[PDB]
Structures are given as structure tokens and as C-alpha cells.
């Protein structure tokens, strides 16, 4: 139950393109990609 409530009588500032949650995603996703990449076979024999 990922509950949310509307706040009574509230407004709030937001700043798209300033939030760093996005930046966390940028490096988290990259890190994950590499995390699964790392345990794998190199193809450098194919440079022949």
C-alpha cells in the first residue's frame, strides 16, 4: 500500500532540471549495467 495523501492547504516549489534524483538514476543505471557486464567473456580474439 504505497499510500499518498493530499496535503491540506499546501503548495510547494519544484525545480525540474535541478533535481538530482535524475542524476542518481544516471549513475545508478550505468553502474547496474556494468555490474552485470563485468562477469563476462572478452571478445578481443575477434580483432583478427
Amino acid at each position: 500500500n504505497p499510500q499518498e495523501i493530499h496535503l491540506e492547504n499546501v503548495t510547494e516549489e519544484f525545480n525540474m532540471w535541478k533535481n538530482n534524483m535524475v542524476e542518481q538514476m544516471h549513475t545508478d543505471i550505468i553502474s547496474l549495467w556494468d555490474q552485470s557486464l563485468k562477469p563476462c567473456v572478452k571478445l578481443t580474439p575477434l580483432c583478427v
Binding site: 572478452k42 578481443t44 580474439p45 580483432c47 583478427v48
Partner: protein, 140 residues
């Protein structure tokens, strides 16, 4: 003893090409080097050229560059040679002979992650038995 066969002798006009053929019984060219030799009466042997028994190499004595080619029938049962530009001083006994070689790596680098770098080459070991030969002469 593998039978060897070669083209009949031929007279040719000056300034022009001739062609010869040879055969090995049992298709034994697959196991022997193809070679061609030239000789004139009263004169020493001259190597003309070769083909590897694998057929992956060919070559000529440098005197023949741009005048000679070597080809073979599929499955290498027979071989051929073409000579070009012949003149009256090219009259000679031509030969087809089988041959042997030693293949030794000439250089290497071991690679941990791939095939070793390698260089290889061929050294002729012996001539094998000679064909009966062909005679070619040039006249008007």
C-alpha cells in the same frame, strides 16, 4: 613409384607463349611439391618454379617473373605451366618433378588471449623423382 606424365615436345614460333601439363598417378600431388625445371644441353639445371603440396604457395626463379604461371586441375590430379614470350634462346628441356619441403615456424609471439602471432616458411628439402620431361624449342 608414382607415375609421372608430361606434355609432348613442341616447336613454337619466336616471340610467343607455350603451355605444358603434367600429372601424378594416385593424385599424389596432394602430398608433393610441384616443380618445374629447365635445362639446356651442355648446361646446368635451372629451377623454374613451384607449387606447395598444400597448393597454398607458388613461385618462380626471378628470371621468369611476369612470364610464367602455374595452375592445376581441381583435386590437383594434374598441374600446368604456361610460359610466355619465348624466343629461340628459350629452347630447352623442360621438366616436371615432384618434391618435398620442411615447414617450420620462423617467428612467434605467444598470446594469452588469442592465437599466437606466428610467421612460417618453407624450406625445400629434396627433389622427389623427376618426370620424363618435355622438350620445347623455338623456330620460324
Amino acid at each position: 613409384q608414382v607415375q609421372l606424365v608430361q606434355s609432348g615436345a613442341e616447336v613454337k614460333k619466336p616471340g610467343s607463349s607455350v603451355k605444358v601439363s603434367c600429372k601424378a598417378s594416385g593424385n599424389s600431388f596432394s602430398n608433393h611439391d610441384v616443380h618445374w625445371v629447365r635445362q639446356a644441353t651442355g648446361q646446368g639445371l635451372e629451377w623454374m618454379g613451384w607449387m606447395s603440396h598444400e597448393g597454398d604457395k607458388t613461385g618462380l626463379a626471378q628470371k621468369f617473373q611476369g612470364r610464367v604461371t602455374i595452375t592445376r586441375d581441381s583435386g590437383a590430379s594434374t598441374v600446368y605451366m604456361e610460359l610466355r614470350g619465348l624466343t629461340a634462346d628459350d629452347t630447352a628441356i623442360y621438366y616436371c618433378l615432384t618434391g618435398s619441403k620442411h615447414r617450420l615456424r620462423d617467428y612467434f609471439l605467444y598470446n594469452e588471449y588469442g592465437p599466437n602471432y606466428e610467421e612460417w616458411g618453407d624450406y625445400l628439402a629434396t627433389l622427389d623423382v623427376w618426370g620424363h620431361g618435355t622438350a620445347v624449342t623455338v623456330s620460324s
